[PDB]
Amino acid sequence: DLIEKSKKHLWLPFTQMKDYDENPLIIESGTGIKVKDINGKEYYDGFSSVWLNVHGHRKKELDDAIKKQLGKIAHSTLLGMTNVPATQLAETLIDISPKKLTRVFYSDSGAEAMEIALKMAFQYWKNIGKPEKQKFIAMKSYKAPIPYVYRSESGDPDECRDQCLRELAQLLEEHHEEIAALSIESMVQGASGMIVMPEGYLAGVRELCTTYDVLMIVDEVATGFGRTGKMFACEHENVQPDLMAAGKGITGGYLPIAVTFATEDIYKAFYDDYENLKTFFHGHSYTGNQLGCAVALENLALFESENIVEQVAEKSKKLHFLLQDLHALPHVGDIRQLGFMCGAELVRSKETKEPYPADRRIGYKVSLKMRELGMLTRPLGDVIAFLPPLASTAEELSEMVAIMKQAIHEVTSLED
Amino acid sequence: HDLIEKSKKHLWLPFTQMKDYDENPLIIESGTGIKVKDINGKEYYDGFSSVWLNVHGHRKKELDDAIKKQLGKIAHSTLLGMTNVPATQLAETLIDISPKKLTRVFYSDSGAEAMEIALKMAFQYWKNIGKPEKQKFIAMKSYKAPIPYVYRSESGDPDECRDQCLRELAQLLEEHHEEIAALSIESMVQGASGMIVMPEGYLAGVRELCTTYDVLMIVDEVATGFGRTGKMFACEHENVQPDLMAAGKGITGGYLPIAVTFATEDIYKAFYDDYENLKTFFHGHSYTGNQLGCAVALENLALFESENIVEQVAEKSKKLHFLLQDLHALPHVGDIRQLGFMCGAELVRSKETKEPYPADRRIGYKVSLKMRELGMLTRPLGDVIAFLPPLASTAEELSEMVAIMKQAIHEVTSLED
Ligand SMILES: *Cc1c(COP(=O)(O)O)cnc(C)c1O
Ligand SMILES: *Cc1c(COP(=O)(O)O)cnc(C)c1O
Missing domain, CATH: 3.40.640.10 (Type I PLP-dependent aspartate aminotransferase-like (Major domain))
Known part of the structure; x- marks a missing residue:
């Protein structure tokens, strides 16, 4: 019930509070590249807490x-x-x-x-x-x-x-x-x-x-x-x-x-x-x-x-290959990457690359599916941003990419 | 020495003429209660609460x-x-x-x-x-x-x-x-x-x-x-x-x-x-x-x-008022203003012209530098000497800071006519 309280006194940045009220999330602690909510559910920090977390938490x-x-x-x-x-x-x-x-x-x-x-x-x-x-x-x-x-x-x-x-x-x-x-x-x-x-x-x-x-x-x-x-x-x-x-x-x-x-x-x-x-x-x-x-x-x-910068440049090589097979999904129009700065642009037709109408909330829907599948990120329109902590291991990267692939498929096949 | 030289080499400070900083630099290393300590070990009353944000003192x-x-x-x-x-x-x-x-x-x-x-x-x-x-x-x-x-x-x-x-x-x-x-x-x-x-x-x-x-x-x-x-x-x-x-x-x-x-x-x-x-x-x-x-x-x-900080501030503010009215009697203090621990002494060249010193005499700055040598930090607002002590300041500390401010003011200002 810190939850019903949260709905009462906060006004969050860049967010429709109605969206928040319908799907509240309250983080309690973190360790490595995972954060934990007040119910004990863990999530991969797939966006580095909005592009700033380098070495993970604590x-x-x-x-x-x-x-x-x-x-x-x-x-x-x-x-x-x-x-x-x-x-x-x-x-x-x-x-x-x-x-x-x-x-x-x-x-x-x-x-x-x-x-x-x-x-x-x-x-x-x-x-x-x-x-x-x-x-x-x-x-x-x-x-x-x-x-x-x-x-x-x-x-x-x-x-x-x-x-x-x-x-x-x-x-x-x-x-x-x-x-x-x-x-x-x-x-x-x-x-x-x-x-x-x-x-x-x-x-x-x-x-x-x-x-x-x-x-x-x-x-x-x-x-x-x-x-x-x-x-x-x-x-x-x-x-x-x-x-x-x-x-x-x-x-x-x-x-x-x-x-x-x-x-x-x-x-x-x-x-x-x-x-x-x-x-x-x-x-x-x-x-x-x-x-x-x-x-x-x-x-x-x-x-x-x-040697963080070298490690990032190194790990980014296999990361690229993981992302390109993401590209194979029917609604993944474009994969963009420089280092650990990535995005998967979602589209209704990859042939004509026509986007979904904005009012289908595809990006938001994917982010919510990833949330339940245990991974945080923030969509930019219908681009699924992926900015993992710089300390992410090859293994952790492949796990985060897998969750992305599943969420995108599960959401977009319904066209939600 | 090289901390001081490095400081002049790579910093660009907020609201400050770097030439001023360069001729009188100050580097803080630690703080205890309402005092900060520079890298030479000299201690200063935090007379402006580190620019109006320090409440209980340092550490x-x-x-x-x-x-x-x-x-x-x-x-x-x-x-x-x-x-x-x-x-x-x-x-x-x-x-x-x-x-x-x-x-x-x-x-x-x-x-x-x-x-x-x-x-x-x-x-x-x-x-x-x-x-x-x-x-x-x-x-x-x-x-x-x-x-x-x-x-x-x-x-x-x-x-x-x-x-x-x-x-x-x-x-x-x-x-x-x-x-x-x-x-x-x-x-x-x-x-x-x-x-x-x-x-x-x-x-x-x-x-x-x-x-x-x-x-x-x-x-x-x-x-x-x-x-x-x-x-x-x-x-x-x-x-x-x-x-x-x-x-x-x-x-x-x-x-x-x-x-x-x-x-x-x-x-x-x-x-x-x-x-x-x-x-x-x-x-x-x-x-x-x-x-x-x-x-x-x-x-x-x-x-x-x-x-209850708030009640303590309101209480101590009564005596503070008396100490400031004392300051008010100096030849070049034209006005004293106060609400709680939020204070200023306005310096003037003439008490009932209330004619200010020309701005280019830099009276506020000079006073702030004199207070610094006297062991107290504040920032002047033009020729208004701000005084905003930490909320935890004792009556004794309040009287001590006001006395440094009084001394600094007459010491500078007596030389400007
Ligand atoms: C984050 C961001 C900003 C704004 O930074 P804030 O700390 O959120 O104010 C500005 N430019 C770019 C490129 C950013 O990513
Ligand atoms: C300090 C101050 C500000 C600006 O706050 P910053 O944290 O320095 O950006 C705004 N209004 C008043 C009255 C202030 O004293």
Whole structure:
């Protein structure tokens, strides 16, 4: 009856509370890559608690890092001063980030880190006397398209790539003098349905931004910290962001810490005598929280000593083969994967690739079937996301993929 | 030495000119009670409660234990489409201690996120119920409307100031309410603007006008929340019932980032419907309802109960007032403002010009640096020296911090004429 109480006082993020009331779920504990509910039923953490859990739950080293920091101080401010763990973590993050990035600006969430990146971009140009550069390009302000090869007319990766790059170039051509920055997810569009960008695409946008003197903001909130088989996904194409947002996996999934990385050139445009009004007057009260910073330092220590990134890249090879036989199912239209970042797009006809009408709630229905079959994930429309913890074993991966295959079949054959 | 050099090499600090940090850096290593200790071993009174969030002091044993216990279960699992135990229990406790009309808890990571969520809730509320014209908001200082600043008003009278500002609000609402979704206001004290305490009856007046003109009242309790003004929430001072209320900072006793937007049932129910009907509030964050933060918040609220912090703040605030009135007598202290443990001393170049020092003399900053050498941290708000001591501060500690502040103020300010 914590259950009937839950229905009374909560308002959950991104969720229709009527859906919640009809199918409540309350998690009590976790161990390894499984979480347990208040009835004792276990589930594989098939989405890494929304793309942030790295080493599974109750990871000893992580538990210990927080316990240790408690023994010193939980929180002191970064407003006008600093603390030991935030400073140490800043140096460590800079060691592993793309080389052009030299500064760490903390915040609480990935959304905050992105918002800061945009404000930085905007004020940067104003600070250096170019107040005309105030517009933004959001790749899906002006908007420019990212390749969606699966639903393209050519079905051709680099045709699609080149055509999208041509359209961005046109946008850049006639408005660059007015544009402060372009924002883009690194390599994989998450919320859009785990859409992996064709080779050379991200590199191409970097090139255009440099050419037309526009700051490139790269969102690594989902992709960062090993998720795609590289520490940061922009390593796949050797891209150097001007500003880079990270969060989620940074703390191994334990606590809210997020970061906006900037280059030295951006930082110095705000560095001056106070009187000169160059200061970046933004931030948050919990910025650089010791508890969160302490757990992130140990998270990173583990990446190094557990060779997590190599292990992810290795395991991703067999994972691909498991997924392709998933492709065989009558309603699996497309399989998309980069590292442990995967999605299975569901469709009513794989020949015409016509989707189900949204009102058949296929994605939701699959997620519920997987739930009863003992696995958590979150659907994106009718794309079944699969983002297993980075510590997942080959065995655990094959078990999670099997549950996906069964749920998809059991649901979609009724067409639900 | 190299910690200090590394600090200058890779950090970009919030709300701070890094050149200022570079010439006077400060790195904190630990905390005990209401004191923090830097890496050189120098100790400082936490005069601003680590920027208005520290409640019981640092390394509060019960707080530490609460987090260790929760670690033994699970650190984080999602509230996206499901929930967890600590977040569920905390929500019930929060509803019990919050204004009665507020029945729903929507978690986020920060006070800013919780205010952003309140705005989006209000906007979509009106659209959901078929009045999409209600798309603007009022921000008290979107239309802006003025809050009473009694100290440098014509009359210097609270009632007169209150009544005038309410008259301006009423006219704005009379003329534009059909286009307005919500009004946003800090509860009783404007913090960042200089710890400006609202005159008696003003907040209630705002609530009445909002109700009268069908505008949702968003009350920001991020600074005032959790005992800071000598009530659990500041809107208790005038018995006001917000439509939406933002809370953060002190919620966890100052340990961890968790935040809440409270809503009424009428608001909640406008988003509750068959999914196909498109009433859903599609916003939120990945760390919403984080177990570690919710666990420490539950123990924070337990300690509020078992030590009645709120009554103690209200009691100690009486003597604090006397100590501040003493400060008020210094040549360059123009005004003293206080509600509970939420205080500011406004510094002026002339007491009955109340002419401020030119901003470029950096008086507030200079005073804050002098307090630092004197063993006490705070942050100035322009030339207002904020004083927001942890709620657990003793009468003796309160007198000690006020004395450092007094000394710092005359020491700096006597050299500026
Ligand atoms: C602290 C504060 C905020 C912002 O909260 P953050 O956690 O720093 O993002 C909002 N409103 C008021 C009144 C505050 O004091
Ligand atoms: C998670 C996510 C965000 C937002 O992060 P929050 O912590 O939920 O605010 C931003 N960008 C991307 C790519 C994300 O995956």
